[PDB]
Amino acid sequence: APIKVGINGFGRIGRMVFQAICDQGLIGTEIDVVAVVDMSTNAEYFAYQMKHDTVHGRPKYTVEAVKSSPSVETADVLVVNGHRIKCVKAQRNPADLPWGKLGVDYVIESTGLFTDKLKAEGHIKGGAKKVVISAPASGGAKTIVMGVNQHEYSPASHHVVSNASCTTNCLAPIVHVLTKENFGIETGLMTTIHSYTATQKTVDGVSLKDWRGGRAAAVNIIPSTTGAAKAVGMVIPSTKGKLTGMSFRVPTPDVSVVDLTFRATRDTSIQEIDKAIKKAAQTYMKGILGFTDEELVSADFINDNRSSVYDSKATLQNNLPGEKRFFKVVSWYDNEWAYSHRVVDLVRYMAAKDAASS
Amino acid sequence: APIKVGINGFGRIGRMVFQAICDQGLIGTEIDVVAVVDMSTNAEYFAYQMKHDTVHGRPKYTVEAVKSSPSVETADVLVVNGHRIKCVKAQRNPADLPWGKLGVDYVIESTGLFTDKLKAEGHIKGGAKKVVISAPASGGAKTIVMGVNQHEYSPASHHVVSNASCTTNCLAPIVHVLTKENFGIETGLMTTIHSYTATQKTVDGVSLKDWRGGRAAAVNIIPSTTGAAKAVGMVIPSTKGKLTGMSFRVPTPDVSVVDLTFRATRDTSIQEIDKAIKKAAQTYMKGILGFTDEELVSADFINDNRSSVYDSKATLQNNLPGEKRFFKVVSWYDNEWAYSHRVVDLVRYMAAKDAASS
Amino acid sequence: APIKVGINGFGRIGRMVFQAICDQGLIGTEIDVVAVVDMSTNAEYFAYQMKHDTVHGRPKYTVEAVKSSPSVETADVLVVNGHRIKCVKAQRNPADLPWGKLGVDYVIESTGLFTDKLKAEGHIKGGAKKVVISAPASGGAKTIVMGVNQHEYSPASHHVVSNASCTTNCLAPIVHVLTKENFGIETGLMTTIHSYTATQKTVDGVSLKDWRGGRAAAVNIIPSTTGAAKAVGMVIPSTKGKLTGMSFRVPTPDVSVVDLTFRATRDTSIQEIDKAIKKAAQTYMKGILGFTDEELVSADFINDNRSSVYDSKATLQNNLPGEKRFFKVVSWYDNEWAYSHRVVDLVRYMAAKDAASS
Amino acid sequence: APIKVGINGFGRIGRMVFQAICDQGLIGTEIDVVAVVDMSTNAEYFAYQMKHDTVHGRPKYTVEAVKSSPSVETADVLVVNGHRIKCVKAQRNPADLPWGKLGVDYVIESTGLFTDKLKAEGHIKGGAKKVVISAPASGGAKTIVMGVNQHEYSPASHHVVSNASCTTNCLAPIVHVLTKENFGIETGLMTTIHSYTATQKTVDGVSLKDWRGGRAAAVNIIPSTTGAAKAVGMVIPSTKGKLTGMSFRVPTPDVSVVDLTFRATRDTSIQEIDKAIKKAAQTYMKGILGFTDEELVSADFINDNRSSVYDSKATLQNNLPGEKRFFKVVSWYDNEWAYSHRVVDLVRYMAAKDAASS
Ligand SMILES: NC(=O)c1ccc[n+]([C@@H]2O[C@H](COP(=O)([O-])OP(=O)(O)OC[C@H]3O[C@@H](n4cnc5c(N)ncnc54)[C@H](O)[C@@H]3O)[C@@H](O)[C@H]2O)c1
Ligand SMILES: NC(=O)c1ccc[n+]([C@@H]2O[C@H](COP(=O)([O-])OP(=O)(O)OC[C@H]3O[C@@H](n4cnc5c(N)ncnc54)[C@H](O)[C@@H]3O)[C@@H](O)[C@H]2O)c1
Ligand SMILES: NC(=O)c1ccc[n+]([C@@H]2O[C@H](COP(=O)([O-])OP(=O)(O)OC[C@H]3O[C@@H](n4cnc5c(N)ncnc54)[C@H](O)[C@@H]3O)[C@@H](O)[C@H]2O)c1
Ligand SMILES: NC(=O)c1ccc[n+]([C@@H]2O[C@H](COP(=O)([O-])OP(=O)(O)OC[C@H]3O[C@@H](n4cnc5c(N)ncnc54)[C@H](O)[C@@H]3O)[C@@H](O)[C@H]2O)c1
């Protein structure tokens, strides 16, 4: 049973979803990537985009750009590891995409334009059974963070699911062991020192909706907002209105770090917390939550696919010496990598439960 | 008589041309900026963008944002030292712009989207008399570099003119005094090590016309094409087919350097060349061509309004010892600031020549 | 009566303390900078460093390099605006410095090698009557943040004064009015997102005492320690053991931002806190604390000489909506420029007190 | 029969040479690394430097740090792949290093300090049989570029050998096929847009020998000099007084590119030169000279061990269309990694020739 997926928007996350599908062994055997969609249908230019990444390197798979038939002027079929993917043209409305016809059942929505559960339904109107939004979703969609609440999915009810944001996926696992191990956050504020993204600008330009976010990106520390402010309360309803935060966008191109400051419900210590987070990383959060005892800096997490990886030393040293309630917890994440692995983990969970019931 | 100008595209070059008008003492008196055009009309946002620049800092003029009538919702008039500039909404076609209505005669075309003579003429159809494309132009518009061939301008024939590009305004001064002082160039190639611009990308992205241009801009040395390649031959026909070159877009926000390598027409020396450039700096090319004897790096050329500023020490330490024909000439330039100043000098030179005749 | 000073270690803080002295209009008239001490005595090189700064531009003063005698090989005296500062060679011990000879009474200890009280007394034995260390000090030196506790300085008891770090001169204003306006801080942790310094490395290199800190500076978010972790308790005895923090060094050359997360003593609001700080900013903290109501990023604080300028918007927008105990204060600072001005303002304060008593 | 080698200065080149020895299969069987030398004897700090590199990522090999006796305070032995390397304490004179005692015959000198052939013999007085200087040398040390002139090595008389610089290793292959294939280079001039290195400064600071080299590294285009200005004439004497160049140090942490403008000795075409370089890349320069047909940028050459990998499209698109003599040739290089592999290549060659005769 090849899960038939199509990628709408072959950008940073689209191309890293694609690469997490090939690197993890699933192309053409477990998941069938039927088609990819973006502005051009020049498969040679997509191959160029895949083969050479500034931040994550050359990939291990191989890519060819072949035509479907010599009647077409430019290569339109991509051939990865002998698997053929089709380069479909970008549609302004989700519904004008031929999903049903190409036989695509699960569509990964990663353009960034269709974050509303209502516009994303246009995929299903085009023929898709399910939709995963690689972002926070507005308008009613289900937001799941793997390792914390993927089980609340239901094939029957949830058809446009959302995998939250990179920072949610990092914060929430931290929050989830704090509650489940019962330290509890009474209240919590959080900062994500975060790499710049494709929504920012090389030099000072136009950004109407966030004035600061239009400042030259690679030469300014830019205050702005994070997506995990809302979404962690959505995933864990016990933190609704207990926790919020901001974002500082600094001049690195990938990897970010969460910096959570909370107050505990019961009296505890940072040694108890560090123990429970390591334990959790080895037992029930394994693969999603990780930890590190080394003096790592940010470029040591490029290509690290844990959702969140707790920094044991930066935490243990930077807390109040005899504290029972006021705690800092530092944790890292490759905002482009681990998040692209979680999208594929979610597709496959959903396909499993969709077959499990119908 | 105030020159009635309208800036279409209030971006890096739009806002720097504006500020140059204020810093030189022309607003309201010598130059009247009737209107500016961009993706919004919210003048409180153009205020912010004028008041805070990452590279060139805070401006000396004062900016206020007020509403034109109490009927409007967001402040839509700019007021720069008690002079009113209007914030007109952007139009997809130049012909649709109310230029004759607003009373604008000269339009500075700096959107980047209308570098063709004919899409630029839509301005004259919208009620403008003359257009200055802040870029090189296709379709056949007049290309004039100030200090070299601005005298070639005719009020009768040149309605869409072009002030070439930043690199062309840096290299043609140098090429000009080499041809005029009789050293001559037999053939020559050129390289601009240049700052990234707003067409480049924060993280690797789409740029289907120059594939390399699409790669993360601030973490890479990106080879690409320079404007001064086509344009130095248009300005000096003597260099047609004898001079071409490339760009290496490097991770700095502003200022670029030209690295000219040429073979001279007669047997000379680099000290003869160094003295002639210094001479031409102090005599005929003043304010256009400049020079330095100091050990400077790119940050020192921020806000240097010279088109070309020769580096006497880098040229001299990095040429062959007793050479008569093969030489290197190095020359800096603030690609944002000096080019903007030269646009204002062109507007003013055209507007005076037009009055002197009609 | 010119306050006889000499600067030991003319680097970033040494040249910004020097430009602060000249710019405020003090050189020659109120402060006589007798000598500057560094690894060289080539006043031509020192003058290359003064005239061109990558982050703070061309200074307002003029620097000339003169020979004291034609008997010396290279220029060894700096003539800044007609005034003569001598270039004395750098000694490995403060003690062997000719202070008593040169006439120097106040020494600004900005090498960063003699931060302990006792190696700092090495200047006094050698002739200086007073010493200001541009850094937190060990061995029991008096730590003073201007505008918070300079009233505690006594000419009799305190000869080796510490002006604390740049982050404590940013954090200590805000903790001072938070206690003075009785909100009070129960406990609190802080993070500074901070620009890389002279003590960091261009590529991965050696740093034996903090491992992460030797990593490539300009391409990593390097977690580390801050100086305000100790210093704010030395200055504000109330905060002894209630507040600590950490630093994240990010890829910008200058300007940083504190981000304090505290739990207040009483029940309050962020609009209450917002008013209390702004008020304080206009009244008793005017010149030390500042605020902004604008959407500014880090490069808008280059050359802002307030110790701490509070960002009203980023705070109000990024706090929990109806909270009474748990808050986040965000505040900027130009760690090179603001600090240096406090140095010149401590010399000036201490000096007159000494002249008041003896 | 292992070659016994010691590395003095375990910095960027020392650690990359170490990693090229383990990568190429050579550690413990073909080359035995008896000792590494740097500021510390802390095996743990060395292991942290080896395992986490910002640019070249995690090494494939495994590093442990053990104590050589129960008596030593801190781990002083590395155990890379079961092979034990000693951590010898850094010395001020090469001669005070225990090479004969340890049993070291070949010494990779890579501190950046002992670049004089006389200072370098200190190693042979310390007990070593040969010295390789990872940098151009003075005082008459024989200079070799692998792939161009290592056949000029005489076991007999060449004792302290210099492997030239990274730019001579890129430049000399190109210059070598142009003279061997009989295009010739009459006079030539080059420029290398180049990543910053460890001799540079994060923020503006001290640099007495090159004034510009002290300016903040990651925020300027810094003109400077190159090592291949001297060394290529020494490897290829045909080109002494005929070829020279300069350097621009830009904000990338690794990879650099050679922009070479030369005039041929005979009428030829850029198409012809392009074929010759590809041909050479495939036959006698293989593994040393490569080429690319792709639209690559600097980051695509990280971990590319060819010494000089020619850009076919950048060279072909940026030359004069009718030219027969005056050309531009562009070739890339990972200045840390390819040079490191070549140092191992020379040590290996040298050692086999020395065995062959004695
Ligand atoms: N960048 C990150 O680190 C990151 C992390 C987590 C989640 N995400 C989320 O994923 C989404 C996409 O982010 P990204 O960083 O990949 O951006 P991106 O711009 O690099 O990629 C988006 C791609 O969508 C394409 N596209 C736009 N409109 C399209 C359309 N109508 N039809 C087809 N293709 C279209 C664009 O050309 C682009 O290639 C965003 O919602 C973002 O929040 C990004
Ligand atoms: N920045 C430089 O280094 C530089 C130097 C020399 C010449 N130029 C030339 O100037 C032109 C603009 O360059 P820039 O660097 O200012 O870019 P920019 O993107 O900062 O500015 C262009 C502005 O035009 C606006 N715009 C887009 N469409 C518009 C429309 N239809 N109507 C009105 N406004 C519109 C954009 O929002 C933007 O603010 C380019 O063609 C470039 O070649 C730029
Ligand atoms: N840069 C900042 O943001 C900042 C802010 C606040 C305080 N400081 C502090 O000020 C001190 C200097 O820091 P910096 O950033 O200016 O560093 P820097 O390295 O630029 O300045 C140090 C200067 O001292 C010189 N020097 C070294 N040894 C000397 C000696 N023995 N005698 C005389 N001069 C000597 C160096 O050549 C250099 O010019 C440090 O203690 C630092 O903590 C720096
Ligand atoms: N990195 C490049 O791009 C490159 C390319 C070609 C050649 N090289 C040459 O390599 C040499 C070293 O440069 P690098 O880039 O490795 O710099 P680096 O500063 O990273 O390495 C030098 C190492 O030597 C150590 N060291 C200093 N003094 C020592 C001493 N007295 N004894 C023993 N070890 C000592 C330092 O701790 C440092 O780790 C230079 O001569 C350079 O020109 C570098």
GROMACS .gro file of N, CA and C in nm, chain B residues 39-118:
model
  240
  397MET      N    1   0.319   4.986  -0.314
  397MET     CA    2   0.215   4.892  -0.271
  397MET      C    3   0.114   4.936  -0.166
  398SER      N    4   0.135   5.055  -0.110
  398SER     CA    5   0.041   5.108  -0.016
  398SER      C    6   0.028   5.258  -0.036
  399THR      N    7  -0.061   5.306   0.047
  399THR     CA    8  -0.093   5.446   0.054
  399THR      C    9  -0.072   5.489   0.198
  400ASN      N   10  -0.068   5.395   0.296
  400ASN     CA   11  -0.044   5.428   0.436
  400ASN      C   12   0.090   5.498   0.450
  401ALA      N   13   0.081   5.631   0.462
  401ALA     CA   14   0.198   5.716   0.473
  401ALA      C   15   0.264   5.702   0.609
  402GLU      N   16   0.196   5.656   0.715
  402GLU     CA   17   0.263   5.629   0.840
  402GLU      C   18   0.371   5.521   0.825
  403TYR      N   19   0.348   5.427   0.731
  403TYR     CA   20   0.442   5.323   0.693
  403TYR      C   21   0.550   5.384   0.605
  404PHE      N   22   0.530   5.469   0.504
  404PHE     CA   23   0.642   5.531   0.435
  404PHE      C   24   0.723   5.617   0.531
  405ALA      N   25   0.663   5.663   0.641
  405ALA     CA   26   0.735   5.748   0.735
  405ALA      C   27   0.844   5.668   0.804
  406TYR      N   28   0.800   5.553   0.859
  406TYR     CA   29   0.884   5.455   0.923
  406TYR      C   30   1.001   5.418   0.833
  407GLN      N   31   0.974   5.368   0.712
  407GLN     CA   32   1.073   5.336   0.610
  407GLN      C   33   1.167   5.450   0.572
  408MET      N   34   1.123   5.576   0.588
  408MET     CA   35   1.211   5.690   0.562
  408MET      C   36   1.293   5.726   0.686
  409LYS      N   37   1.231   5.712   0.803
  409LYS     CA   38   1.293   5.748   0.928
  409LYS      C   39   1.397   5.651   0.980
  410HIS      N   40   1.387   5.523   0.944
  410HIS     CA   41   1.480   5.419   0.987
  410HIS      C   42   1.538   5.331   0.875
  411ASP      N   43   1.660   5.358   0.831
  411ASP     CA   44   1.725   5.280   0.728
  411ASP      C   45   1.840   5.197   0.785
  412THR      N   46   1.845   5.065   0.761
  412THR     CA   47   1.951   4.980   0.817
  412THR      C   48   2.090   5.028   0.779
  413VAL      N   49   2.109   5.069   0.656
  413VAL     CA   50   2.242   5.097   0.611
  413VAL      C   51   2.284   5.241   0.623
  414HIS      N   52   2.192   5.332   0.589
  414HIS     CA   53   2.227   5.472   0.582
  414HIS      C   54   2.171   5.549   0.699
  415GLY      N   55   2.113   5.480   0.797
  415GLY     CA   56   2.063   5.544   0.919
  415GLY      C   57   1.945   5.640   0.903
  416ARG      N   58   1.931   5.719   1.011
  416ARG     CA   59   1.829   5.824   1.025
  416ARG      C   60   1.850   5.940   0.927
  417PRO      N   61   1.753   5.995   0.854
  417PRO     CA   62   1.774   6.112   0.766
  417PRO      C   63   1.768   6.249   0.834
  418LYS      N   64   1.823   6.356   0.775
  418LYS     CA   65   1.820   6.489   0.838
  418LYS      C   66   1.687   6.562   0.819
  419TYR      N   67   1.608   6.538   0.714
  419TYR     CA   68   1.473   6.593   0.704
  419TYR      C   69   1.371   6.552   0.812
  420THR      N   70   1.256   6.621   0.828
  420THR     CA   71   1.154   6.571   0.920
  420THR      C   72   1.037   6.513   0.842
  421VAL      N   73   0.984   6.404   0.897
  421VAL     CA   74   0.875   6.335   0.833
  421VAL      C   75   0.760   6.324   0.930
  422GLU      N   76   0.650   6.367   0.868
  422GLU     CA   77   0.519   6.355   0.926
  422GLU      C   78   0.421   6.291   0.829
  423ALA      N   79   0.325   6.222   0.889
  423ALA     CA   80   0.219   6.160   0.812
  423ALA      C   81   0.084   6.208   0.861
  424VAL      N   82   0.012   6.265   0.764
  424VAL     CA   83  -0.120   6.323   0.784
  424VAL      C   84  -0.216   6.274   0.676
  425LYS      N   85  -0.347   6.290   0.706
  425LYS     CA   86  -0.455   6.249   0.616
  425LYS      C   87  -0.490   6.364   0.523
  426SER      N   88  -0.503   6.341   0.391
  426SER     CA   89  -0.535   6.448   0.295
  426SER      C   90  -0.668   6.522   0.311
  427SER      N   91  -0.773   6.444   0.344
  427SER     CA   92  -0.907   6.490   0.379
  427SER      C   93  -0.943   6.414   0.507
  428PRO      N   94  -1.028   6.460   0.598
  428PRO     CA   95  -1.073   6.382   0.715
  428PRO      C   96  -1.156   6.256   0.686
  429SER      N   97  -1.192   6.247   0.558
  429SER     CA   98  -1.270   6.140   0.496
  429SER      C   99  -1.195   6.007   0.486
  430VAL      N  100  -1.061   6.014   0.467
  430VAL     CA  101  -0.976   5.895   0.460
  430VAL      C  102  -0.944   5.840   0.598
  431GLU      N  103  -0.922   5.709   0.591
  431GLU     CA  104  -0.890   5.622   0.703
  431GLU      C  105  -0.746   5.623   0.754
  432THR      N  106  -0.645   5.609   0.668
  432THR     CA  107  -0.506   5.609   0.710
  432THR      C  108  -0.435   5.725   0.646
  433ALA      N  109  -0.349   5.788   0.726
  433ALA     CA  110  -0.272   5.903   0.681
  433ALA      C  111  -0.220   5.880   0.542
  434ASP      N  112  -0.246   5.967   0.444
  434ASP     CA  113  -0.201   5.937   0.308
  434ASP      C  114  -0.122   6.045   0.234
  435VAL      N  115  -0.074   6.140   0.314
  435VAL     CA  116   0.011   6.247   0.267
  435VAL      C  117   0.134   6.246   0.355
  436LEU      N  118   0.245   6.259   0.283
  436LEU     CA  119   0.374   6.275   0.345
  436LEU      C  120   0.403   6.421   0.365
  437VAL      N  121   0.475   6.461   0.469
  437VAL     CA  122   0.509   6.602   0.489
  437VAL      C  123   0.654   6.608   0.535
  438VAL      N  124   0.739   6.643   0.440
  438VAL     CA  125   0.882   6.643   0.460
  438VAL      C  126   0.935   6.785   0.457
  439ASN      N  127   0.954   6.833   0.581
  439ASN     CA  128   0.994   6.970   0.612
  439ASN      C  129   0.886   7.064   0.564
  440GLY      N  130   0.766   7.035   0.614
  440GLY     CA  131   0.648   7.112   0.577
  440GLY      C  132   0.610   7.117   0.428
  441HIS      N  133   0.663   7.027   0.343
  441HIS     CA  134   0.623   7.009   0.203
  441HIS      C  135   0.538   6.881   0.193
  442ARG      N  136   0.426   6.884   0.118
  442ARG     CA  137   0.337   6.770   0.104
  442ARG      C  138   0.361   6.687  -0.022
  443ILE      N  139   0.389   6.559   0.001
  443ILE     CA  140   0.407   6.459  -0.104
  443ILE      C  141   0.288   6.363  -0.091
  444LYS      N  142   0.230   6.321  -0.204
  444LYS     CA  143   0.116   6.232  -0.200
  444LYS      C  144   0.147   6.086  -0.228
  445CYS      N  145   0.083   6.004  -0.144
  445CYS     CA  146   0.096   5.859  -0.149
  445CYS      C  147  -0.015   5.794  -0.233
  446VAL      N  148   0.024   5.776  -0.358
  446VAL     CA  149  -0.060   5.714  -0.457
  446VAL      C  150  -0.036   5.563  -0.461
  447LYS      N  151  -0.150   5.498  -0.477
  447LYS     CA  152  -0.159   5.354  -0.495
  447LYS      C  153  -0.106   5.314  -0.632
  448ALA      N  154  -0.027   5.207  -0.618
  448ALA     CA  155   0.040   5.138  -0.727
  448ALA      C  156  -0.049   5.078  -0.834
  449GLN      N  157  -0.002   5.103  -0.954
  449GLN     CA  158  -0.073   5.056  -1.069
  449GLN      C  159   0.011   4.958  -1.148
  450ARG      N  160  -0.060   4.853  -1.194
  450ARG     CA  161  -0.002   4.748  -1.276
  450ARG      C  162   0.045   4.797  -1.412
  451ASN      N  163  -0.021   4.901  -1.464
  451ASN     CA  164   0.026   4.963  -1.584
  451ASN      C  165   0.063   5.108  -1.554
  452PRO      N  166   0.179   5.155  -1.601
  452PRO     CA  167   0.216   5.297  -1.604
  452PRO      C  168   0.117   5.395  -1.666
  453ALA      N  169   0.039   5.354  -1.767
  453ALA     CA  170  -0.062   5.439  -1.829
  453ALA      C  171  -0.177   5.481  -1.739
  454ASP      N  172  -0.208   5.392  -1.643
  454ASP     CA  173  -0.312   5.408  -1.543
  454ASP      C  174  -0.276   5.501  -1.427
  455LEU      N  175  -0.153   5.553  -1.426
  455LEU     CA  176  -0.111   5.644  -1.320
  455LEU      C  177  -0.156   5.788  -1.349
  456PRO      N  178  -0.224   5.860  -1.255
  456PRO     CA  179  -0.276   5.996  -1.272
  456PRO      C  180  -0.169   6.103  -1.283
  457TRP      N  181  -0.075   6.090  -1.376
  457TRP     CA  182   0.037   6.181  -1.374
  457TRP      C  183  -0.001   6.319  -1.417
  458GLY      N  184  -0.080   6.335  -1.525
  458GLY     CA  185  -0.124   6.466  -1.573
  458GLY      C  186  -0.222   6.537  -1.479
  459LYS      N  187  -0.295   6.453  -1.406
  459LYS     CA  188  -0.391   6.497  -1.307
  459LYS      C  189  -0.316   6.560  -1.190
  460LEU      N  190  -0.220   6.485  -1.133
  460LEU     CA  191  -0.144   6.532  -1.018
  460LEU      C  192  -0.050   6.646  -1.056
  461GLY      N  193  -0.028   6.665  -1.187
  461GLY     CA  194   0.053   6.774  -1.239
  461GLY      C  195   0.199   6.736  -1.250
  462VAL      N  196   0.227   6.605  -1.257
  462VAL     CA  197   0.363   6.554  -1.259
  462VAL      C  198   0.407   6.561  -1.403
  463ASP      N  199   0.534   6.595  -1.421
  463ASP     CA  200   0.591   6.602  -1.554
  463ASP      C  201   0.702   6.499  -1.565
  464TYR      N  202   0.797   6.501  -1.470
  464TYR     CA  203   0.906   6.405  -1.466
  464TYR      C  204   0.878   6.287  -1.371
  465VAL      N  205   0.887   6.165  -1.425
  465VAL     CA  206   0.869   6.047  -1.344
  465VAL      C  207   0.999   5.969  -1.337
  466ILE      N  208   1.034   5.936  -1.212
  466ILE     CA  209   1.149   5.852  -1.183
  466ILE      C  210   1.089   5.714  -1.163
  467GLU      N  211   1.130   5.634  -1.262
  467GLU     CA  212   1.089   5.496  -1.273
  467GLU      C  213   1.192   5.403  -1.212
  468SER      N  214   1.150   5.364  -1.092
  468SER     CA  215   1.227   5.278  -1.005
  468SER      C  216   1.146   5.166  -0.941
  469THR      N  217   1.060   5.096  -1.017
  469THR     CA  218   0.986   4.979  -0.969
  469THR      C  219   1.062   4.851  -1.000
  470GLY      N  220   1.141   4.864  -1.109
  470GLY     CA  221   1.221   4.753  -1.160
  470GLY      C  222   1.144   4.674  -1.264
  471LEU      N  223   1.011   4.686  -1.256
  471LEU     CA  224   0.921   4.616  -1.343
  471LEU      C  225   0.909   4.680  -1.481
  472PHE      N  226   0.953   4.805  -1.513
  472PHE     CA  227   0.929   4.864  -1.646
  472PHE      C  228   1.055   4.917  -1.714
  473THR      N  229   1.153   4.827  -1.728
  473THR     CA  230   1.280   4.863  -1.788
  473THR      C  231   1.279   4.869  -1.939
  474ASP      N  232   1.161   4.849  -1.997
  474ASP     CA  233   1.147   4.859  -2.140
  474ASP      C  234   1.079   4.990  -2.171
  475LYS      N  235   1.149   5.058  -2.262
  475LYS     CA  236   1.110   5.182  -2.327
  475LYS      C  237   0.960   5.200  -2.338
  476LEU      N  238   0.901   5.097  -2.397
  476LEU     CA  239   0.759   5.091  -2.421
  476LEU      C  240   0.674   5.071  -2.298
   0.00000   0.00000   0.00000
